[PDB]
Design a protein around this ligand. Structure first.
Ligand SMILES: [K+]
Ligand SMILES: [K+]
Ligand SMILES: [K+]
Ligand SMILES: [K+]
Ligand SMILES: [K+]
Ligand SMILES: [K+]
Ligand SMILES: [K+]
Ligand SMILES: [K+]
Lengths: 292, 292, 292, 292
């Protein structure tokens, strides 16, 4: 549920840029069959930025219905205004989602005290479990371990998706929080190293197209079989990197289409179709992973 | 109009975080009397992040109403979804604003080609002049000179608010664009240098509280009297730095309240109240500028 | 010998700035008694920068004599001119040192190919085992994993001191080198995390004053008792950080003096005596480690 | 003398890496004929890193001998040990050099107070004018404006070669120092901007191969004809960038050899031969400058 290989699932779109229900169902059945632990619905990879809140709720509610009780669904609920974060979260109260993935406010660059106040007010207007999400290179803002320590004392703040790719953060945070506070990597290329240091799983872009390898990799890691998990990581490492050859989720949507998992690789502006040179790059990395 | 000291005006709020019309009137009267070139309404310093589009449009319309033809108004219209950017611009068509200040998509980190498609599409669906706005430390994305040069060929893309504080950008942009494209600094601490290199003015936080000195400094810079403009800038320099001692607009709203220009220094979460130590750093910057 | 807690030993000096033999002997006996695995003599911490090559050789030869066969001694042999690196290394041929610690050329910023050529020529004019040393924040140059992979094929290039504090490098490098190529951390604050990922030890500043704790910490780590190694790391973490409160080795020399381990804390310009505020900082961190 | 286009001259070498006197003569004749203000002998571009102090002193004495009173010579005299810095300066006392170019200690990362003590001590033991040299990306250390302002009060510390390319530094230094302190750019690509902001000239790599254009560009900048200087700079700009496509002085030595100004493009390890792709990037920059 909050550990192992968690997919940050693309929002597959028809050519008009609206959610494609048939492609979404294909994707969800693929995750149930592959062993994926949970689905993060309309996170970064799911283009939260270009969906209005109604669209975004529709996709979450559609994903939960299609999951049909077979796989837990976590909703992306980030907003950079605290009143908007609370209001988006309330759409999902008493819904069936098992928890929220909520990013540090982006753009407005709050202090650590404003981060603390933002997440505490969100946690207060819900019963859902909250996973903090730190991704400074997107938000302009870095949620520090000390602040995570304060927030971990709030009853329903239960974990963090740490996407800095800064491995020292796993044990800085673990030292400050209780033993059942979940630590998840948001950086595919370092996620196995992150679990080896004591993280509990990964919210993954790579799991979109390599769900079975990823689930297998996190099970081995959780059991302590790191040399064995690493054989899989090496096969996947070209994808861990090349799925960011162009801005995520441009490469992974193309990879989904190439694999027959979705009908189209359409995205919303300002995301642009994959270039010819990106196609070639992602094709080669899919081949190396044994997927094509 | 698009030149000189342009203020990125605060959105003054009452204690419930609602726009305070009386305070906004006082600020606008102050700018008209002090020689400010234009007002940027609901930019970054105006808390665009925490106003929904409807409140956003009310603040701009209220500003135009209060301004009463006495001073031009530019609306911030940035959004990280192209469709939203376009649709927000439409609310301002025929409003009386003289142009729009439109930021690079934040958070989703599009490519240069996606930035190009983003601003081209926005520019296509309006007659209003467009000013591109680059501030990578907020958005996670850096609009490069080459892309500015391509976008400058669009009839109604008329300039750029360059907030990197990277001064090599002035002449890299300038050699790629026509002589009438306006180059505006978005970084108060380096804005006089930017103008000395060829920039045409500043969209400024300092000007909220030092309107007259800013206006004189930018007129002296425009006429080439850099040594004379530098004397005023040295006296405003603690303000240029200390209005950012805590996240902008926290220090500048406190400063406006301390001068009596606005009734309260209230902000919206995730912006938090100024700390005592911040109060003292800002008061000392205000005194060094001769404002208290 | 090339694993466990390896001390980067200070060069204790009398008040004239020359090596103090009695303080050096005190330090070496302290390491033999504490369980320290090996001594790096005239590395960074030993002020290689301010010793001329004769002075530097004298200190190495003096350290080896005092060690008297009880503890292996590794010589710092870095130089940014390849002919100087070869000539310094030759001073130690047939000497009793067990190997060299050789830093990437500093200042002149060579390419990866120049790094390759520099270390390969050094390795070729010696029989001593070579440990590569990467510390970009001092040298301006970053020896990448791919280049380490090439150099690991040279017979007597046997290991790397990785001082970036970038943990992803442990497994990037391990993937490329054979299983007996040694990986040592050059960053105290992350060295336990570095061993947990599969590193074999640490060349340590902290071991100068906490040699027993450090030796114990690396033995637990090597045996897989990470939760137990981490109890020690937490007690030492204020020292891991505060020993860089001022430029290394200014704080550790002061700490050596405060502990009675050396007679004076004299350094050579451009290193300057510890400030009063640094003293207080290092004193508190020594107290937290249970040492004072 | 301390103003205008100053060349950081290459040390031309034969195939065995020894100074090539005939080539050095040709370069010096070229600078005297082309209007270059002064020659920096054995700076960074002169491979100070790989000449021992004795070879270093020979190259400077040979340069003064060849110059024969026709053009002033400044010696690089940097060292990361204060005692060595002092002792190298003594070799140049009464030599005929007009001053010294002395870099911030590299590698050992002293504090601002240690930089202050370092340069003050060097300045104390000579009558020669001293030019401070800041280049953090080589040295790991950044000499800050405040420390420059303190050092400028020393009688014979007369200027700074500022190589950060951070243009805000020009007026931060200038307001802290007397009007006669010289500000020199050490970054060719931003040197015209630096001069437009108030700097007095450039210690330049480009000037090795574009001496006349550089000299005219710096005289036009000194007289305030920035638009005229900008036309020449636009034509030298590919050279400003591409003389750094591989580590400087690799591209500029190849360029001198391609022009026939020196007999060979040999460097000392760890500098390596130019790659074929580098050859082609540099040839194209040379052609764009009109030099081939
Ligand atoms: K609650
Ligand atoms: K909790
Ligand atoms: K239009
Ligand atoms: K235009
Ligand atoms: K050998
Ligand atoms: K080897
Ligand atoms: K003197
Ligand atoms: K002076």
């Amino acid at each position: 549920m909050f550990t192992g290989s968690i997919v940050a699932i693309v929002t597959p779109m028809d050519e008009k840029g609206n959610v494609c229900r048939a492609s979404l169902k294909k994707l969800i059945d693929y995750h149930v069959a592959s062993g994926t632990s949970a689905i993060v619905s309309v996170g970064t990879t799911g283009e939260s930025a270009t969906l209005n809140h109604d669209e975004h709720a529709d996709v979450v509610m559609m994903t939960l219905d299609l999951a049909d009780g077979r796989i837990p669904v976590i909703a992306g609920t980030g907003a950079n205004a605290t009143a908007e974060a609370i209001s988006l979260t309330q759409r999902f109260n008493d819904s069936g989602i098992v928890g929220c993935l909520t990013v540090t406010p982006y753009y407005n660059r709050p202090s650590q005290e404003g981060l603390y106040q933002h997440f505490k007010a969100i946690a207060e207007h819900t019963d859902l479990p909250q996973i903090l999400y730190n991704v400074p290179s997107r938000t302009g803002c870095d949620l520090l371990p000390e602040t995570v320590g304060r927030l971990a004392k709030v009853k329903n703040i239960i974990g963090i998706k740490e996407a800095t790719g800064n491995l020292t953060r796993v044990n800085q945070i673990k030292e400050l929080v209780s033993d059942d506070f979940v630590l998840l990597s948001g950086d595919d290329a370092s996620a196995l190293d992150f679990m080896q240091l004591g993280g509990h799983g990964v919210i993954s872009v790579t799991a979109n197209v390599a769900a079975r390898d990823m689930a297998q990799m996190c099970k081995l890691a959780a059991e302590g079989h790191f040399a064995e998990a690493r054989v899989i990581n090496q096969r996947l490492m070209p994808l861990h990197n090349k799925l960011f050859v162009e801005p995520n989720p441009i490469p992974v949507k193309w990879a989904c289409k190439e694999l027959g998992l979705v009908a189209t690789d359409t995205l919303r502006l300002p995301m642009t179709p994959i270039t010819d040179s990106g196609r070639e790059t992602v094709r080669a990395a899919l081949k190396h992973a044994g997927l094509l």
